[PDB]
Amino acid sequence: MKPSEMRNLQATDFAKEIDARKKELMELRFQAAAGQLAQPHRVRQLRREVAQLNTVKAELARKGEQ
Amino acid sequence: TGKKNLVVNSVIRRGKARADGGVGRKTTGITKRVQRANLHKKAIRENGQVKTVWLSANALRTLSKGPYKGIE
Amino acid sequence: PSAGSHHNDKLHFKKGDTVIVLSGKHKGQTGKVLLALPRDQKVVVEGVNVITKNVKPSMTNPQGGQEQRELALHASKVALVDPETGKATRVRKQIVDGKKVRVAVASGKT
Amino acid sequence: SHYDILQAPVISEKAYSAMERGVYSFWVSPKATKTEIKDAIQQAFGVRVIGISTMNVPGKRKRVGRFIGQRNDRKKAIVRLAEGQSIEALAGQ
RNA sequence: CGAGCUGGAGAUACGCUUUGACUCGGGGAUGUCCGAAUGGGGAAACCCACCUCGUAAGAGGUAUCCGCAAGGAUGGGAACUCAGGGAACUGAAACAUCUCAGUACCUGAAGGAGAAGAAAGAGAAUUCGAUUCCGUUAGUAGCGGCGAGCGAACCCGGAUCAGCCCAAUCAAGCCGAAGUGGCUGGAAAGCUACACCUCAGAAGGUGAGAGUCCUGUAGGCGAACGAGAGGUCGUUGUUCGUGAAACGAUGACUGAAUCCGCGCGGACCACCGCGCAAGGCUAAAUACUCCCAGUGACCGAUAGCGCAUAGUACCGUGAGGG
RNA sequence: GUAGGGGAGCGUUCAGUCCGCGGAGAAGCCAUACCGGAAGGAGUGGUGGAGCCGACUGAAGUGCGGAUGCCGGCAUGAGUAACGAUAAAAGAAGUGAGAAUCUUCUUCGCCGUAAGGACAAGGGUUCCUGGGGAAGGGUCGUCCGCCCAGGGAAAGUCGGGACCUAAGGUGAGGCCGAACGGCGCAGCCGAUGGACAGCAGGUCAAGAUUCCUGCACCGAUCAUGUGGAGUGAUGGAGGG
Numbered sequence: 001m002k003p004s005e006m007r008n009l010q011a012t013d014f015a016k017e018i019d020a021r022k023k024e025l026m027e028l029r030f031q032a033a034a035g036q037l038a039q040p041h042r043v044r045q046l047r048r049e050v051a052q053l054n055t056v057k058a059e060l061a062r063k064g065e066q
Numbered sequence: 067t068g069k070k071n072l073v074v075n076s077v078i079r080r081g082k083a084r085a086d087g088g089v090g091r092k093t094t095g096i097t098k099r100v101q102r103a104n105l106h107k108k109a110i111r112e113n114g115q116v117k118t119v120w121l122s123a124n125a126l127r128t129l130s131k132g133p134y135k136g137i138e
Numbered sequence: 139p140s141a142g143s144h145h146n147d148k149l150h151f152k153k154g155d156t157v158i159v160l161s162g163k164h165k166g167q168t169g170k171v172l173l174a175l176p177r178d179q180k181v182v183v184e185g186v187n188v189i190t191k192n193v194k195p196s197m198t199n200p201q202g203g204q205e206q207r208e209l210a211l212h213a214s215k216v217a218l219v220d221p222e223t224g225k226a227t228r229v230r231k232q233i234v235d236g237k238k239v240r241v242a243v244a245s246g247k248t
Numbered sequence: 249s250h251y252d253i254l255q256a257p258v259i260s261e262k263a264y265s266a267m268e269r270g271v272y273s274f275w276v277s278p279k280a281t282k283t284e285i286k287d288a289i290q291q292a293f294g295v296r297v298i299g300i301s302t303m304n305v306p307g308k309r310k311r312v313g314r315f316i317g318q319r320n321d322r323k324k325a326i327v328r329l330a331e332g333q334s335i336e337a338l339a340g341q
Numbered sequence: 342c343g344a345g346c347u348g349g350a351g352a353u354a355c356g357c358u359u360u361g362a363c364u365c366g367g368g369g370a371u372g373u374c375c376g377a378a379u380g381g382g383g384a385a386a387c388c389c390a391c392c393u394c395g396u397a398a399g400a401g402g403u404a405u406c407c408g409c410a411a412g413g414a415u416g417g418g419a420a421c422u423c424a425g426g427g428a429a430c431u432g433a434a435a436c437a438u439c440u441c442a443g444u445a446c447c448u449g450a451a452g453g454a455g456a457a458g459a460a461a462g463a464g465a466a467u468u469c470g471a472u473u474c475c476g477u478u479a480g481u482a483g484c485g486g487c488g489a490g491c492g493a494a495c496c497c498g499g500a501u502c503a504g505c506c507c508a509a510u511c512a513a514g515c516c517g518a519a520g521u522g523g524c525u526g527g528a529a530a531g532c533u534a535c536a537c538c539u540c541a542g543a544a545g546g547u548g549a550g551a552g553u554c555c556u557g558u559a560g561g562c563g564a565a566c567g568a569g570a571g572g573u574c575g576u577u578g579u580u581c582g583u584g585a586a587a588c589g590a591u592g593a594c595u596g597a598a599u600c601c602g603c604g605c606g607g608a609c610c611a612c613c614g615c616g617c618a619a620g621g622c623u624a625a626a627u628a629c630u631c632c633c634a635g636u637g638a639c640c641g642a643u644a645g646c647g648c649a650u651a652g653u654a655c656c657g658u659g660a661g662g663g
Numbered sequence: 664g665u666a667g668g669g670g671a672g673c674g675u676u677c678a679g680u681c682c683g684c685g686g687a688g689a690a691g692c693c694a695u696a697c698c699g700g701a702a703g704g705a706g707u708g709g710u711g712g713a714g715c716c717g718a719c720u721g722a723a724g725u726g727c728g729g730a731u732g733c734c735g736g737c738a739u740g741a742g743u744a745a746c747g748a749u750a751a752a753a754g755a756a757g758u759g760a761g762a763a764u765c766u767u768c769u770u771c772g773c774c775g776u777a778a779g780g781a782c783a784a785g786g787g788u789u790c791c792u793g794g795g796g797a798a799g800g801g802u803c804g805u806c807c808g809c810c811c812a813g814g815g816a817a818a819g820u821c822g823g824g825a826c827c828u829a830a831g832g833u834g835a836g837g838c839c840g841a842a843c844g845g846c847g848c849a850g851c852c853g854a855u856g857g858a859c860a861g862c863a864g865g866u867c868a869a870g871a872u873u874c875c876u877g878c879a880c881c882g883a884u885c886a887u888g889u890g891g892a893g894u895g896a897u898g899g900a901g902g903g
């Protein structure tokens with residue numbers, strides 16, 4: 001979600017943990033359209049996770065490569 | 067526009083009557099005060115490699131003597 | 139239009155504090171603070187009580203009678219009390235927690 | 249990527265009656281193409297698309313408040329699959 | 342910063358937060374497509390490509406002008422700056438030189454300023470000592486169909502103050518003194534009785550009018566790490582309108598001297614005096630106000646900006662108008 | 664006593680000063696038979712609901728009946744002219760708070776080289792369904808092209824593009840020009856033209872040469888065999 005237990009993971013695991021949220025994030029949209037969206041907060045939260053993910057896989061890209 | 071030292075620009079053209087005579091005769095009255103433009107010419111000259119360019123006639127002289135940065 | 143900036147979106151109480159109501163009706167009456175709206179300058183204390191009507195046709199039964207609920211105030215209640223009445227605040231330091239600064243006056247308890 | 253593109257499923261009664269024929273309809277990215285859209289469905293749902301027909305759709309409401317109004321702009325994609333039909337179970341909604 | 346937050350939003354549902362949300366100050370990271378627009382096309386925001394890396398997704402490149410290359414230029418700025426080009430209505434109680442005016446407008450180049458600048462000078466004391474600006478001289482000197490009208494400079498006082506080079510503290514923010522009872526009132530901050538603070542009685546708020554109720558004010562602290570040549574012809578500039586017209590300036594033709602030398606001193610000569618052009622840079626004083634703060638014998642809803650917000654609605658093919 | 668000149672003052676906003684007043688009721692508004700020589704000023708009462716009078720002095724965006732003045736509101740004409748083709752309309756039944764006007768049935772009448780039907784341009788959701796009934800509808804609406812919400816639009820073959828060129832536009836190089844710019848070979852852009860593969864049916868409430876059923880066609884990459892050696896440009900010609 002936010003600490004060093006997130007960045008510690010592999011490169012193809014970062015791409016994997018991005019799309020895992022997106023699969024849910026799309027299912028939430030399909031639920032929203034139907035009228036079974038009792039947890040709207042989950043949508044805001046999942047999108048936040050993808051942001052942090054992409055932010056980090058750009059912090060570690062610049063570090064080492066100088 | 068002449069290649070060595072740019073040219074073209076010009077000004078006005080007066081035209082008086084009751085002219086000539088007794089020092090200042092009676093006087094000289096103007097009937098013109100209009101507006102004019104004066105110009106120059108072109109010839110083939112090259113420095114560095116190939117170029118034809120516009121050549122100021124009074125700088126065509128300047129070149130027939132000592133090459134003033136450019137050459138024939 | 140303006141609104142509660144005349145202060146600094148800054149209050150003198152927390153959503154827990156016991157406060158006495160200085161000025162107006164409900165003068166002197168005390169109560170716990172249950173809602174603090176800093177920008178709006180609102181206080182929901184167990185003080186000023188109101189009888190609000192319910193415009194509720196389709197809204198969960200047409201049985202929308204009268205409701206017992208308390209209506210919010212401003213700075214028309216002097217925050218924090220211990221020598222039985224309203225006071226200012228002056229002496230800060232730390233308790234066991236250094237990071238926190240307490241409040242007190244002619245006495246020393248909040 | 250895969251999971252984006254398909255914004256939502258087409259609700260309505262005509263799509264729900266199409267559902268019954270193994271014909272699935274979706275609201276997709278307006279910029280998305282037929283090839284790109286076919287790929288995303290084939291992937292995310294794990295089913296072969298035997299045909300894709302698609303078309304763009306406009307907007308324009310307001311109710312009150314002389315607030316001009318505005319379009320909304322979508323794209324609807326409708327797909328047919330071979331005898332091995334069905335999407336998830338998210339068909340019998 | 343220290344408890345609330347979930348934009349205006351006057352709106353419910355889901356939630357987030359002392360393992361410190363929110364907000365504020367300072368950095369980063371992402372930044373679709375159009376636009377200088379820049380791969381190519383195009384009726385802006387859309388079509389259509391090629392090349393390199395790649396598991397697809399996806400990423401990078403492909404415009405011309407400068408230069409070896411690093412690196413620079415295109416485009417946008419309210420007004421201000423210099424430059425190229427440059428009106429007429431109007432005044433002259435007609436009009437033609439003249440005036441309006443080198444104003445308005447167009448165009449170019451640029452910056453936070455620019456311009457100008459380091460005496461071939463001003464000038465008449467053998468004084469001065471780069472430039473710009475302000476006062477003044479002075480409506481003087483002068484120019485003028487000597488008409489309408491136009492109009493300097495030197496001296497002096499003042500702002501600022503440099504001459505150099507080449508060619509042979511302020512934003513985030515924290516701390517901050519001191520009033521209680523009765524009365525009138527729906528409501529006290531007013532009235533009344535005694536009281537205190539004052540390096541703070543500026544100001545806003547609070548049911549009405551507030552030093553002592555809140556925010557503050559005087560005063561103090563305060564940040565990891567954040568900014569501060571001569572000539573003839575043609576013409577013209579300045580008070581310069583062919584005048585006795587010098588001097589600068591340059592389109593056409595010509596064309597020198599080199600310090601017992603050259604230019605200037607209002608035709609011109611001699612004498613006396615001032616100065617070294619034909620190479621470049623150069624801060625400050627000056628100007629303007631998109632923006633920011635403070636203030637006002639400025640406005641307070643037909644006022645004040647066009648707008649208590651809208652360049653919207655409406656009008657127009659459009660520029661534009663509103 | 665007109666133009667005009669001279670004198671003394673009244674009133675408005677703002678300002679500095681002083682005296683005050685005010686939620687036990689300020690300004691403003693309304694009524695009035697009171698005062699002053701006039702501009703004017705006060706008392707009382709009524710409304711209002713939070714600011715304000717008096718005096719001195721200062722400064723002005725300082726006094727309106729006129730401008731075919733400007734902005735706004737409201738009158739007159741007047742319940743008047745009109746209600747937009749002289750192609751008619753009638754009854755029944757229905758719905759509804761309400762019906763000449765909405766629905767349905769049976770008649771009538773008008774168009775029928777159109778007043779029917781299919782594109783294009785242009786418009787933009789006006790389409791279909793369910794609701795509505797302020798305003799728009801020259802009357803009325805229960806209705807509508809109006810208002811609200813939901814839906815509807817489907818292409819290898821039809822138009823356009825990934826093909827072509829005309830006028831014209833642009834245009835490296837190039838030719839000209841105080842600037843801004845003007846021209847211009849190839850090339851490129853540019854349909855109104857050339858080129859090029861699909862027909863017959865079905866049917867949503869609302870799409871159809873697009874979806875669906877039937878049976879076709881076009882090109883591309885690969886595979887399996889036939890086949891056994893050429894393939895044929897940015898240029899030639901024919902042809903379009």
Ligand SMILES: [Mg+2]
Nearest residue numbers: 641642643644
């Ligand atoms: Mg008003």
Ligand SMILES: [Mg+2]
Nearest residue numbers: 648650651652
């Ligand atoms: Mg505006």
Ligand SMILES: [Mg+2]
Nearest residue numbers: 727728729732
């Ligand atoms: Mg009048």
Ligand SMILES: [Mg+2]
Nearest residue numbers: 832833834847
């Ligand atoms: Mg051509």
